Each structure stands twice: as C-alpha cells, then as structure tokens.
C-alpha cells in the first residue's frame, strides 16, 4: 500500500536516479544504493529542488523581456529557448548559489536530509561553480553570457538565423565592453569568461532533467513550461 | 544441426534457385537443405561461426573471405586437381589464402563496355579516341560517355590499365607494402580521365543514378557498369551492347574482378557434405542454371557452363574485361586503399589539387595501416594528439604528472578538434552510417559541429591555439602548478586573437567565434565519444590506455 503521506516522493526520484545511474557504467552495483539510501532518507530538501522550475521560468521571463528576442520570428524564439534550456537553467544555478558557502547537497566533507548528488556531477557541478566565483562574473556579464547562449545561429530550423547571429555578435561586444572596461588590469578576462561555456555543456540536459526536475511526461522541462503558457 | 546443411546466401542471388538444388540433395541424400538470406548476412556470419554456430557453407564476395580466413572462421576446402580443372584457373586465385583454398568460386563479374547500338553501332576500341568522339555525338544533342566517377571502383580500370595496382600479388599472398596507386601508368590514366571532364567530355558531378539514367533513355552512347545494371535497362529498352572496355596506351583496361564464392564453415561437422553438394550438385551446368534462372549470375567460373553462357555476347563480354583486370585483394587493407582512390579521383577532378598529388597522397594512405577500420584510425587521431602535445616546448617543462593529468582530462576535446580539422577538407571520413537511432542524431550534431568550423575558416594556427585552450586548463583538479597552465591558457589566447585579427581584420568578433566553437567538443559526452570512435578498454580511456601503454613500452 501507498503510505497517504506529503514526504513519500523522494522514494522513486532517489531510486530512479540509482537504477538509471547504475545501468549506465558511472556508477557500479554497490555505488549507487548508498546515494538512493541517503537520497531517499533525505526527504528534508528535495520539493524546493524541483521547485528549480521558476529558475527555468526565470530564464523564459528574461528571454521574453529581451526586444531583440521578441522581435524574432515566433518559431524561431521558442526553438532558441528548447534548445538552450540546459544551460540558461545551470547560469542561473550558478547564479544563485554564486554568494553561497553551502548548499542544499553537500556531498565529501564529514549530509542529512539533502540530495546526495552523484560523483562526477557534483565533483563538476562545484568545480564550475568555483570558476565563476573565482571570477568577478557580475550581474551584467552573465546576462550577456545568458544572451550568448541563447543566440545560436548554427542551431537548426531557425527561419532567420542571419539575424540570431547579428544578436550573439552585440552580446560579445556587451561582454568584451563590459569585461575591459570593470577590469582594465585583467587583459585576457573576455575569453575566460567564454571559456566558462563548455561547461554549462559537460552534463548533458537530459541528466539536468533527471537531477534537478520532477517528471515530465515525454517532454523536456522547457516544452512542458512553453506549453502550459499555451494552454492558457 | 549435424547431419544436415545450412547455407547463407545474399536477397538479391538466385536464392530460390539454391533451394532447387538443395532439395534434390535432400531427395538423393536424405539431408536436409534449408537455403536462408539473413539481412546482416556479411556480418552477422563472423559472429555465429567466430564461436560456434551459423551456416555449414556462406555465398559471398571473396573480397570479404579475406577476413574470415585470418580468424579460422573458413574451412580448408580439398578439391581434386580433376575437379580444379572444370573452373578458370584464375578464379581460384581469387579464394586462395596463405597458399590455402578456402572457398569454392561460382560467378564471375566485372565492369565492361555497355554502349547504344542506335546512337554509336561501333564503340572505341581505345580510351584516346573518345574525346573527338564526343564532339560528334555532341552534335545531335548527345554525349559520348557516361559512367559514375564518385567511385573508385569505377574509375580504376582507367587508372591501373597502364601499371596501376593495388597490392602486388607475389608469392601466394599480397604485399600490403607495396602499393602501385603513385606509379607512371597510375598518373597517365588518372590525368586522362580529369582532361574529359577538363574538356566538358564528361561530368566529375556524375554519379551512378545519373549515369543509368542518361543512358537508358538515349542521352549517351556508352557507360560503364556491371551485369545488374542490365535486366534494368531491359525495363525501358534502348538497343545496347556490352563489350570490352577500351585500351589506354594501347593495355587493356584493368577492372576489378569480383568473384561470387562459397566457403564452407570451419566449425562445421558436415564439411565432407558441404563438399559433395558444393562439387557433384551445384558447380554443374544443371546446378548452376537453377541459380541462374531465379536470378542470372553472368558470367561463372565453370567452363562447361560459361562456354554455354559464352553465346550471350554481354556476358562472354564481361569474363574477357574480367579476365583483362585484376582480383580484388581479400586483404582488409583494401578499406585503406578504397579511401584514398576515393579522395584522390574525386579531388583532380574537382580541381581540388593536381593528378600527381592526388595519387602522391592516396599513395601513403594505402599503405596507411590507419585507414583500415573507424577505430585503428581514431587511435591515430588521439596519437598524433599526444604527440603533438609533446612537441610543445611548454608542455615538456610541465610537472610529469601535470602533462598527464591535462591529456587525460581533455582527451576527448583534443581529439575531436584532430577528426574535425583532419575532416575539414574530405566530405566523408569517420562517421556516414547510411547508404533515428541514438548514433544516427549524434552524427547530425558532429557533423554540423564541422559545417561550423568550415563556415569560420580555421587554419592550422587557429587549431594549434585551440588545442592549447583546451589542454592547458588550469581549474583542472590534481594540478601541481596550475598558475604556469593559466599563463599558457592565457598566451595561447592572446596568440589566437593576434592571429585572428591579422588574417581577417574586418570580422572584429572572429575570435569570440572561434571560442564558441568549444562547446560543441563536449555535446557528446567522452563516454559516447568512446563507444563511437574507439575500441575495447573495459573500465578506462583511450588516452588512459595510450599513456599506459607508452609506459609499458
């Protein structure tokens, strides 16, 4: 029988996580039920985890209030957003824990409670974490790195990609206008920061999904929130 | 399973004609014959018999049974020098190994002369006459020759007919040494064939399908292809005629002699069966024809029932431009071989390059033992990675453990940026599938990722640089002196934006460009990356097992 209770969730989404991780090779038999015991136990802190949806939300509301974005064909703007989905939702991530110490997933100290992130994940997720905070990345060049991200001419079934490729130029003369003009002692800081970006790419968005978003059916975080803004 | 005999034969072979034949086996013999047509026929048999199961006898190439012999998946067949007299002597060449039979050969085919006996009742005996033959036809709104140029195998003959080869065929076995590709009748024949088109006598565009269509309606006088382009001209029904390809410096033309053979099982309990139904059943003018007649084989390598096809002027045609070419090597370094004709014959006429440094190249990449399969030339790409990163004289002044810790951890970015720019030039190298699944979107990606870089127009400085970018990355974790990697991330960047502007000063954001390019060298994890491009390691890295292995060396 299913115990009627609220904290019963992360029963599956630990378990989910473990079976998936485990018949997939980054993760052996035994390493695997450790992090589902102390991910599942971990109830305390896992609905405000997947409530990382108006982080997401976020991203779209940004997009949205961009002119140049709005000025697109319709198509074009929700075919930016799916595709970028991933890395618009880790800059904000990353974003929000910047001013942070802890987090609600620690993992290698001497957790309770939180989401026990797996190995390379959070070795990763830190690490690039750490990078943006070793840099003075402000509120500016992150929207400029948000737009970079966003403006992909080469990505495909865009009807007027001239134009997408026109916007990520602007966004690097923002950036490299931004970056030089804050920090005139640091002479190479433009490409460092674009040096960040393969990062946001170093955990696929499908693990993104798995990791910090409830179900979805089929569908990536990002249609089901284009969507249920359609339905309406 | 051990009293009877189960054989694999390819859809389009007269594999209803086999049954016929096997039935009367079953009808004399009270052994059951059960013919079937796997679709992965070629390669699903080296995985049943590579440990213990499959057919007793499999119908192939014997291009292919090259590679079956080397892993004893063919039996040694035994036949009487009075039996090996009944078929060509040069077929039997054809399925030999290590001075061994290992096959026994059925069909012959061959590339000869198909022409249109309305527009031109009299072909050329020779190649040099066929460019002023064409401004004649040209005249009344035709053309001389057409034939597909994309393909090696179709533009050879040309190539070899004056001392062009393969692999020299000495003692028994092939030389995968010595290569006949760069020769003096390799460039006479090559040089020939781009001045056609050089001179608008033909197409370097012109593939198969433009080919058969041009000339099964009228629009040209000859072509050149096999006998299963004919019952396909027979649909629509131009007068046609095939004949023996034309002559260059007064040698014939060497084609590529494919011949259809049956090996018999090496784990196989009935190859004394397998045996008498291969010799008293089917190599016989009453078993061949039964084949023949489901589907027609050509030409075959048995006398008695050749010189009763012989009649048939197309096919007595194809066995004398066969018996005028040369045996395709069984060798697996014909995959090499294949690739290199291949870029070279489609660069000079292109005008990409020249005919001598088309063949200059092709000529390594034969005897290239990296060019045999996706994996042994990926280990290549990584290889050249490692060395490259050690010609750097930063790198060797790097803490030991530094310079490995920085390949390991970007092996797979390093190594993509080598495919891609060793792919930018070719249009096809390491990863075309089809003549939806999860290795089939990838490859749209990694191509994409190409078309990027082609696009921007990376030179080899912009390639070096971002190599260096993505080697030298000091966050990365184990670090001894990470502040001397950032100094090196850091020039190498300076260095690349110097150079970007310098060859390109009117695109001001070249170099940010260049830099997002980086990203999609992770799209695909490292993971993926190895499953795709690389072979067996259980547990560890390409470059985990090449540095080990330039450590246990």
């Known amino acids: ?10 029963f599956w989404y630990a378990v989910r996580t473990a079976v998936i991780n485990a018949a997939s090779g980054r993760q052996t038999v035994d390493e695997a ?8 136990a971990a109830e305390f802190l896992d609905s405000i985890h997947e409530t990382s ?10 997009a949205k209030n961009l002119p ?12 930016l957003l799916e595709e970028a989905w991933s890395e618009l939702f880790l800059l904000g991530a990353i974003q929000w824990s910047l001013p942070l110490d802890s987090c609600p997933l620690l993992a290698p100290p001497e957790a309770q409670g939180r989401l026990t992130l797996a190995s390379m994940e959070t070795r990763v997720l830190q690490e690039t974490i750490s990078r943006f905070r070793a840099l003075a990345v402000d509120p500016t060049e992150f929207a400029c790195m948000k737009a970079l991200v ?5 990505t495909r079934g865009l009807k007027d990609p001239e134009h997408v490729e ?32 393969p990062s946001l790419r170093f955990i696929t968005a499908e693990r993104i999904e798995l990791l ?18 359609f339905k309406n």
């Open 33 to 40: 039920l450790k992090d589902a015991q102390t991910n599942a």
């Open 68 to 79: 140049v974005f709005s000025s697109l064909p319709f198509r074009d703007q929700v075919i």
């Open 212 to 229: 910090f978003f409830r179900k979805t059916i089929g569908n990536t975080p990002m249609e089901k929130l284009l969507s249920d803004m």
């Open 1 to 10: 029988i299913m115990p009627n209770i609220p904290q019963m969730s992360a």
């Open 150 to 154: 966003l403006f992909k001419p080469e």
């Open 53 to 62: 949806a108006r982080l997401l939300f976020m991203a779209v509301k940004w």
């Open 166 to 197: 026109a916007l990520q130029d602007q966004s690097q003369v923002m950036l490299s206008q931004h970056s030089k003009a804050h920090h005139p002692s640091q002479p190479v800081r433009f490409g460092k920061l674009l040096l960040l970006l």
